[PDB]
Amino acid sequence: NITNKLKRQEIFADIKHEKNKERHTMRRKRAKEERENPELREQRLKENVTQTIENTRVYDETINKEVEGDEDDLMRYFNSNSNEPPKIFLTTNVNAKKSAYEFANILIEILPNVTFVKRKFGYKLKEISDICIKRNFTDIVIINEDKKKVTGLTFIHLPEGPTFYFKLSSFVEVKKIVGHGRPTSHIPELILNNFQTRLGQTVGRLFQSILPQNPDIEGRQVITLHNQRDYIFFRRHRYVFKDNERVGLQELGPQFTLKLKRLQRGIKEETEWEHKPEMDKEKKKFYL
Amino acid sequence: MRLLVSCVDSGSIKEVLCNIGTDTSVQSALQPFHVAPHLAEGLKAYVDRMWVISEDEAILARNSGVVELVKISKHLKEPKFDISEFEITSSVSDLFDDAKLESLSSKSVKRTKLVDGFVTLCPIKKDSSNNTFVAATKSGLLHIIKKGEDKKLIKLASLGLKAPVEFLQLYDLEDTDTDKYIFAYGGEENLIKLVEIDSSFQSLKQIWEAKNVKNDRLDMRVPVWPMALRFLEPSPGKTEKGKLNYQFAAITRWSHLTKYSTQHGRKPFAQIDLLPNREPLSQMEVFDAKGENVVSSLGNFQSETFNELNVITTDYKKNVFKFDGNGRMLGKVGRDDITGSSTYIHVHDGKYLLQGGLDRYVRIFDIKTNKMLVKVYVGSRINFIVMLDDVEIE
Amino acid sequence: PKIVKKHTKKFKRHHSDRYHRVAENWRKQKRGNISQPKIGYGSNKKTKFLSPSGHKTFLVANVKDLETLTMHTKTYAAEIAHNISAKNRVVILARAKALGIKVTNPKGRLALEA
Amino acid sequence: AKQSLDVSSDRRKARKAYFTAPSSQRRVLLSAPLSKELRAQYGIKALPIRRDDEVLVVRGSKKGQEGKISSVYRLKFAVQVDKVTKEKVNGASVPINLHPSKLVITKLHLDKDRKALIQRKGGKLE
Amino acid sequence: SDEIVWQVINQSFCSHRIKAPNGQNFCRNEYNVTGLCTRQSCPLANSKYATVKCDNGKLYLYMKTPERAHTPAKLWERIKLSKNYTKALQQIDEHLLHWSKFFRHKCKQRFTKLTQVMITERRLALREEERHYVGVAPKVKRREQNRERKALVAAKIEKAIEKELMDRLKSGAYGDKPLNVDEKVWKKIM
Amino acid sequence: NPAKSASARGSYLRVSFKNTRETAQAINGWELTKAQKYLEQVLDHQRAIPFRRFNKARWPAKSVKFVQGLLQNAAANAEAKGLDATKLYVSHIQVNQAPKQRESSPSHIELVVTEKEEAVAKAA
RNA sequence: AUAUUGGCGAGAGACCGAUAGCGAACAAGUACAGUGAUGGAAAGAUGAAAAGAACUUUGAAAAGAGAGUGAAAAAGUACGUGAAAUUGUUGAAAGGGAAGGGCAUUUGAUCAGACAUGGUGUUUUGUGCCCUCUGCUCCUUGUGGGUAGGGGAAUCUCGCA
RNA sequence: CGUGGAGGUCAGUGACGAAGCCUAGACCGUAAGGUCGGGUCGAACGGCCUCUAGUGCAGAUCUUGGUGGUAGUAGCAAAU
RNA sequence: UCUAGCGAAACCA
Ligand SMILES: [Zn+2]
Predict the structure, then answer these.
(1) DSSP of chain E, one letter per residue?
(2) DSSP characters for chain A?
(3) How far is it, in rounded angstroms, from Cα C44 to Cα B157?
(4) How far apart are CA B82 and CA E83, in angstroms?
(5) Does the keyword rRNA processing apply (chain B)?
(6) Helix axes E85-95, E101-126, angle to 10 degrees
(7) Does the distance separating the beta carbons of C56 and E22 come in below 8 Å?
(8) Which residue is nearest to nucleotide G48 (CA to C1')?
(9) Which residue of A266, B226, F82, F107 has the fewest C-beta atoms within 10 A of its own C-beta?
């Protein structure tokens, strides 16, 4: 109605004021009535439900669906064998700076039988794949740095296994962490969270394959990959199994964030899944 | 609608009974009537190619080189409908040769190692009661499979071609009476070659080979990786003596639509950059814009006019394209609904589009209206689908 | 050649730190511890307008502007204008590396993914 | 270009004409083009929309939707079509105010005023 | 008229001329051999002219005569240059016989430059490219930052860690008196 | 870490700004319940708020009332987040000025309470 | 035929773009001041759509915190953008009744710092505007330009690989 | 050298981000100043040849607005 | 007389 600035601002502010007065009185009166009766408290909280995005996600049949041929695929495209440990190969991209070398040095301690190389000019990926097959490397990891910042990760299982390109967004070193903790030689346990979609179960089996199995129970260390809203979070922690039944933590090594950008069949052959901003605009799918 | 889907990740087939408008992605939408797993044989032996003989039997291609004849029954699902139950009757094994493929693994464009696959599974004859079918490998092995009178598959011949054969298309247009069996094939630096085989199926003769174009804008050699092909009707007008009478079109790897008139000669008279930067292309289907059926059973475009030709292709990414005879993009097909690289597309009966690929989604599209008819989750990577008769239960 | 600069610092107004309202551009006053601009500090005419790379800079808006530096590659260096959209900057970079012209500011508004 | 002197091309005059328009002029402004089928039916391209007829949405975020117009909100130069709504976090419903230049009429509601209007515009009305 | 045309182009507006920060001038004239806009350089100010210039693949010598000052569609004469570098320079010296030193010299220079550009383009076409350039939209970047913050604040991951550790512990999966848990605390669980 | 941290915000708070800055500087870095008991002792004039800049130790009541109101707010928000009470100590506190007229000098008070960490003894 | 800073209308502008332009882009001759005659302000921008923050909880109430909408609350009716003066917290450093800069250098912190990776000659094989034969076509008709078919590199030769 | 506007031109730039702001980021100018990076931001804006001016500020106890100290001081109808 | 609350102006290279 009113288009004067100072009139309209004043009027709507006073409407807000009267409204918040009434809301305070109403919640206080309901508080008195629920002092009296603890039933209608429960009847309210069962009646109206606080909507959140975690509550409301677009239904996907990939959620809680079993994987067809999961064991043969799991030995096929993934290294899932207690008999055969993985040879992991660190492949830091051409003309790398110092930052990706530091991150590779971090990633040494994470992954088992890990091997680093410095890439040189003029080696195509087929030639590198052939050499790593002859050396029986089963997976290669490519660090993509840019502007002295590690921005991307690439995972390729070598016996014609699938390509994975993750985008690293936010990285924190160990020294910037307040609750620092000192990691040890002991093999940590691992936590995987919210990988329930079929693509999410694929990525979960990927991280389950790449991470070392057989943890050291003596050295109470764990790592963790949480999935939330197509954002996976890497952290790692130490255990205090308390008498008070809540386990105590200390965030030991570095933390960062990953996001799957590209899931491809084979060694960069055909793309199963990609990320697009037009996928992002729907805001309720959450392709995990 | 009834569908049979080669499901890679299970290594099986799935029978789908669903009506028009079935969408598994939405709970409010129509749900499929019946989902049936069949013939699950592990991921090492998934179904490559299926040939439906009219109802009671189908033909399976293994990854173990085995070709399988399967008896098809119907039994009541216990809205009423029959579901289908499968029983393998005959099998012919040992048709792959990966020795040349691992031999040629150095001169190879792809990064992965090379394994053999049944690229072509179809009859040799346009006339029915053929009982003489062909199985083509990536190794250049062409096998002649006879259905026995005891209803047993028996191989007749196993002839060789050049190395990698990405595709092999038969020519079924005209004069089924004469004993002339024309096919074409090509691959990685393996030119499109027309070969006639003898009707006694003991000898072939390479009758034609294409030739490469001149060097490009950069004066570089154009790389040769044809991916697919269909045939048209031959040249009208006067034949030129001793050239050939064949006209046909093809899709390369490097986003080239290549048209071939044998009356013109071995070089391409027409080669089109469809997409920028030489994007990889995967399959190639031909269609009428109004959903009409203008092709052979092997899909050969029953016309003489290249400008009447309209094609649908896929990349190795999530894209499905339409093009005219000139290379103008008629549109993208279902681009907002797919999320995977469509491994397999097919024009069924002129008016339906079978889609299935890495997206684990079977998509019946309309050809004419370009509208999605049916979306189905299947839980497996898709490489091949046949479509049965339309049923409209309730 | 060997670039002489004759003045590393900048020329600031008298009492420019003493007040926030007073700018730092040179304005003539109307002790001698302030360096005053004059024509003696003017650089050598060969060395004038030279980068530390040793080139003369040249603003480039699009590919047609980049093609004007085709012959004078070793003398000049292309600088992409500040307002060029990121679709055009990669085209300019590919064209310039084809031409073999040193781009002064690569990696502007751009990243290298995968 | 502008040939008559009595026509004016001032931006300020044009916006002052637009935003201060009376409602009878607004339903002339609130016009939607017909379908290709309806142009094949009546031989006419665009019409003043009303509420009783049926339409499809050809632009915007709700592109490729359709419905009968609930109400024509002439005061906001806009038109609420039924069943194209945003559902708020309370659960209630509020329609998207559409604009008839972004709409294509699918099924007309024909009236005697409407039939006579089609006739006076040269329509081949059945 | 050529000096009149030149002084119009020089002292007034040459539309192709671009002004450097240095002060130097540059014609965007497509036939101009040198990049510069100088007296010898403007093809508009000179009627005898020559230019090495490439159409899609092949390099052509372009000749301009005063004889065809009118009819600018029929103005430029085209000669296909040889792929032999020596032979093509010989062809230049042939077609520029009894011709001035400036056009032959700068024309040979432009020919060498274009051939070496062809060589580098063949190299870059054959060169493998792992990384490709992506400019990031600020809208996308802001959505990424704020939605990562909303996801991290939304998912209290530490409490869920404590949950799953108690789940693995009470589920079994550690044996009898594990080395993880103290014996009294495990008996309190037991 | 946002997870092991609760927050409380107050805006446009019609208090003397200088006295609020002093009493917010007095409370910084303390355990929540000890700070609240200290503020209760301020109301009984038992212990006083020391004045450092804008000046000796007074007992400004109106500041401390709103302060402990925000402390109750942050404690309720921490318990709704499900934090430990005893580990919970105020970590950040900031006061700055609200706009003058809508001569008075109101303020924007904010505070962040944080659980105290406890480290794990390393194994072998 | 002439004047016309008023009225009723139009149409324009090398005009100003919210301290400008009318005092007044806004409920401006208004609020207000004066007894009166009279004087006379300040005040434009949420968003594409209010979709203006359901619900839980602290809280007299004001204000919060969870949560959510929205492309964006780094747009929350204090709202486009959001400078300086000035304020608060944290970090670092210096000071102990210390004022500022100029030069020059250390120390500390910190940043930048190839998408560089080629050229020359020789050799292998393959390919094409290379060779040969057979054409077609444009005129600026020559020291031309475009273009097809089949063959060959068995030999030569150019370019490319 | 800079600013508003105007004629021509760059088939100039621009929602894959113009203009503006910040920039213990780099560069070129003797300087007036200019160019780019980064951050923020959301819709227009520049280079060149000319035209035109309400065209360049530290002061005028300049005008208007905002903010200090004085000062939690004076003091308690200093406005409520 | 103290606390609490409210809270100036003059003047200011
Ligand atoms: Zn010029």
Answers:
(1) -HHHHHHHHHHS--TTEEE-SSS-EEE--TT-SSSB-STTT-TTS-SSEEEEEE-SSSEEEEEE-GGGSS-STT--EEEEPPSSHHHHHHHHHHHTTT--HHHHHHHHHHHHHHHHHHHHHHHHHHS----EEE---HHHHHHHHHHHHHHHHHS-HHHHHHHHHHHHHHH--S-SS-SSS-HHHHHHH-
(2) ----HHHHHHHHHHHHHHHHHHHHHHHHHHHHHHHH-HHHHHHHHHHS----TTT-----TTTT-PPTTHHHHHHHTS---SSS---EEEEEPTT--HHHHHHHHHHHHHSTTEEEEE--TT--HHHHHHHHHHTT--EEEEEEEETTEEEEEEEEETTTPPEEEEEEEEEE-STT-SS-----SSPPEEEEES--SHHHHHHHHHHHHHS--S--TTTTEEEEEEEETTEEEEEEEE-EE-TTSSEE--B-S-EEEEEEEEEEETTTTEEEEE--HHHHTT-S----
(3) 87
(4) 72
(5) yes
(6) 150
(7) yes
(8) D60
(9) F82
Residue in chain F lying closest to A246 (CA)? F84
Domain ranges of chain F: 1-124
Deposited experimental method = cryo-EM
* Count of other CB atoms within 10 angstroms of residue A171: 18
SS3 category, B128: coil
Tell me if A145 sits within 8 A of A151, measured CB to CB.
yes
Cα–Cα separations (whole angstroms), residue E102 to D115, E26, E27, E31, E109: 80, 17, 17, 15, 11
| Strand pairing class (A221-228; A189-193) | parallel
Non-local CB neighbours of F61 within 8 Å, separated by 6+ positions: F43
C-alpha of residue E27 to centroid of ligand 1, in Å: 5
Q: Which two tokens stand for residue B242?
A: 């001793």
Q: What is the DSSP letter of B55?
A: T
CB of A68 less than 8 A from some CB of B: yes
Q: Does A63 touch chain B (CB under 8 A)?
A: no
Determine phi and psi for A67, rounding to 5 degrees: -85, 130
Q: Which of F14, F23, F20 minimizes the C-alpha distance to F100?
A: F14
Q: Which CATH fold topology does E1-126 show?
A: Enolase-like; domain 1 (3.30.390)
Q: Select from B33, B37, B29, B1 the least CA-distant residue to B354.
A: B1
The CA-based dihedral angle spanning residues B17, B22, B24, B30, taken in that order and rounded to the nearest 10 degrees: -100
- How long is the CA B306 to C1' G151 vector, in angstroms? 29
Pick the CATH number of A70-281 from 3.40.50.10480, 2.170.8.10, 3.40.630.30, 2.130.10.150: 3.40.50.10480
| Residue for token pair 């060589």 | E119
Our CA angle for E73, E74, E78, nearest 5°, is: 115
Contact B137, B119 (CB under 8 A): yes
CB-count exposure of residue E19 (10 Å: 0-12, 13-18, 19+): exposed
Among chain C residues 46-75, those with CB within 7 Å of any atom of strand H: 47-52, 57, 59, 61-62, 64
Give the domain extent around D23. Answer: 1-126
Q: Where are the domains of chain A?
A: 70-281
Among F117, F122, F124, the residue with its CB nearest the CB of A179 is F117
Tokens of A13: 């502010």
Is C46 an 8 Å CB contact of chain E? no
State phi, psi for E89 to the nearest 5 degrees: -65, -35
From chain E, the residues in CB contact with F82 under 8 A are: 159
End-to-end alpha-carbon separation of chain F, Å? Answer: 29
E33 CA distance to ligand 1 middle (Å): 12
Which of B276, B295, B282 lies closest to B351, judged by CA?
B295
Q: How many whole angstroms separate alpha carbon B118 and alpha carbon B64?
A: 10
F47 touches strand I (CB under 7 A): no
CATH number for the domain harbouring residue D54:
2.30.30.30
Distance in Å, CA E39 to ligand 1 centroid: 8
